[PDB]
C-alpha cells in the first residue's frame, strides 16, 4: 500500500541530500560528440520549381477564421462549473473559463458553434457566438436556450477576449464596427439568428427548426430565466453594461463617462 511513504522512509537512512550527490535523470542527457543550397539538385530544375503555381494559399492571411466550439465542449464546460448557464454566455465568459482560445493576430474572428454533441446537449443557455450551424442552433433552442450570432471586428475581438489588458491601456471603450458588406447578409438573417436581424422574423425561423427536427418549440417567455435569456448587447456594445467611450479605472474601482456633447454623439453613433 505504501509507495510514496516507502520512498520517504528510505530517505531517512540515506545520506543527506546535498549539492555533492545530485545527478540528472538517466536518459535526459545525450553525450556530446567530439571530433577528437537546399532545394538544388545539382543542375536540373528543382522539384519545387518545376511544379506549376496554383493559388492554394492566395489570400490566406485575409481569410477569416473561427475557433470551433462544440456542444460537447460547451456541455462539458457547464458540467464542471467553468461556464455558468445562469448568465449570458459570450466570448469573455468562454475565454475566462478556458473553454476556447482566440488568437486575433492569427485572423480569428470568434467562435463558431458546431453541432458535435447535439444529441446529448441538455443545458439551457443564452449564448452569443459569431457563427452557428443549423443543427447547433436547434440543439440549444430545443432545450429552451437562446443562441444569437454577433460580429466582432479584430480590435473589438481582442478587447472582448482579454478585457483586463485593454483596461490597463487607459483608453476609452471603443464602439465595435459593423460587419463588412459580405457578412452583412449573414448577420441580418433570422435563419442565422443574426444580431442585426429583424426580431419579428425570429418566431417564424424558430418554429421552422422545431418542425424540421421534430421537437416542440418551448415557450421561453414562461421561463423564470426569461429576462436573462433575452439579454443582449447593443450592436455597438463590446461589454454588457458598459457603453462605448467609458474609461475603466481599475486602480480606484471607478468608471469615467464623458459628458461632452461632441464625444457623446460620436460614441453613440
Amino acid at each position: 500500500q505504501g509507495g510514496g511513504a516507502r520512498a520517504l522512509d528510505l530517505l531517512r537512512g540515506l545520506p543527506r541530500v546535498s549539492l555533492a550527490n545530485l545527478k540528472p535523470n538517466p536518459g535526459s542527457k545525450k553525450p556530446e560528440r567530439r571530433p577528437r543550397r537546399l532545394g538544388f539538385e545539382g543542375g536540373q530544375t528543382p522539384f519545387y520549381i518545376r511544379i506549376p503555381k496554383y493559388g492554394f494559399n492566395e489570400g490566406h492571411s485575409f481569410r477569416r477564421q473561427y475557433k470551433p466550439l462544440s456542444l460537447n465542449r460547451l456541455q462539458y464546460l457547464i458540467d464542471l462549473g467553468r461556464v455558468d448557464p445562469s448568465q449570458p454566455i459570450d466570448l469573455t465568459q468562454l475565454v475566462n473559463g478556458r473553454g476556447v482560445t482566440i488568437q486575433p493576430l492569427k485572423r480569428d474572428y470568434g467562435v463558431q458553434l458546431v453541432e458535435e454533441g447535439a444529441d446529448t446537449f441538455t443545458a439551457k443557455v443564452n449564448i452569443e457566438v459569431q457563427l452557428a450551424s443549423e443543427l447547433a442552433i436547434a440543439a440549444i433552442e430545443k432545450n429552451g436556450g437562446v443562441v444569437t450570432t454577433a460580429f466582432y471586428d479584430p480590435r473589438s475581438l481582442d478587447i472582448v477576449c482579454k478585457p483586463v489588458p485593454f483596461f490597463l491601456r487607459g483608453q476609452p471603450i471603443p464602439k465595435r464596427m459593423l460587419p463588412p458588406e459580405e457578412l452583412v447578409p449573414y448577420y441580418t438573417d433570422a435563419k442565422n439568428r443574426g444580431y442585426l436581424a429583424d426580431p419579428a422574423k425570429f418566431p417564424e425561423a424558430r418554429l421552422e427548426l422545431a418542425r424540421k427536427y421534430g421537437y416542440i418549440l418551448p415557450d421561453i417567455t414562461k421561463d423564470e430565466l426569461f429576462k436573462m435569456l433575452c439579454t443582449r448587447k447593443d450592436p455597438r456594445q463590446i461589454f454588457f453594461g458598459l457603453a462605448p467611450g467609458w474609461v475603466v479605472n481599475m486602480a480606484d474601482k471607478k468608471i469615467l463617462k464623458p459628458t461632452d456633447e461632441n464625444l457623446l454623439k460620436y460614441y453613440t453613433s
Binding site: E115, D119, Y213, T268
Partner: protein, 147 residues
C-alpha cells in the same frame, strides 16, 4: 442600458416588443406525440446512427382517409404485421438529422398520395425484363376446354 443608432428598436421600429422575438406562434403538420420514435446508437461498426419512426397508419387521424388508403398500397412493404408504417434513416451521425429525414419521408408520402397524376417515367432496368416475363407468363395461360 445603452442604445446606439443601430439598436434593434431604431433599426426595426415596428418590431419593438419584449415578446416580439420570443412569441410561440400557435399557427400539413405531423403530430409528434402520435409517432413512436426509436434510436439505435452506433456500436463500435457504422459511424452513422439509426432513427426509426413508426405509427399505425390505418388509425392515423391526422392523415386523410383517402390518403391512408393510397399510402397503404404504395408503401405496403413498409407496413408491418401490426399495420404500423415503419420509416428508418441512418444517413447521418446525429439523431436530429436522422429524425428529420424520417419526418421528411412522412411528408413526401402524404404529398405524393394527394398528387393523383403520378408522373410517367422510364421504368428501371429491373422492371423492364419483369414486364417481358409477365407478358410471356400470360401467353402460357390457357382456357378450360370444357366448362
Amino acid at each position: 442600458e445603452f442604445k446606439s443608432i443601430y439598436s434593434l428598436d431604431k433599426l426595426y421600429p415596428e418590431s419593438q416588443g419584449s415578446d416580439t422575438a420570443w412569441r410561440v406562434p400557435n399557427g400539413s403538420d405531423i403530430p409528434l406525440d402520435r409517432l413512436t420514435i426509436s434510436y439505435c446508437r452506433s456500436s463500435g461498426n457504422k459511424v452513422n446512427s439509426k432513427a426509426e419512426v413508426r405509427f399505425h397508419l390505418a388509425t392515423a387521424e391526422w392523415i386523410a382517409e383517402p390518403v391512408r388508403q393510397k399510402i397503404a398500397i404504395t408503401h405496403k412493404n413498409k407496413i408491418n404485421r401490426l399495420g404500423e408504417l415503419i420509416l428508418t434513416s441512418e444517413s447521418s451521425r446525429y439523431q436530429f438529422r436522422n429524425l428529420a429525414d424520417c419526418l421528411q419521408k412522412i411528408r413526401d408520402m402524404i404529398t405524393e398520395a394527394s398528387q393523383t397524376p403520378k408522373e410517367p417515367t422510364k421504368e428501371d432496368v429491373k422492371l423492364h425484363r419483369i414486364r417481358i416475363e409477365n407478358m410471356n407468363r400470360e401467353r402460357l395461360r390457357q382456357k378450360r376446354i370444357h366448362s
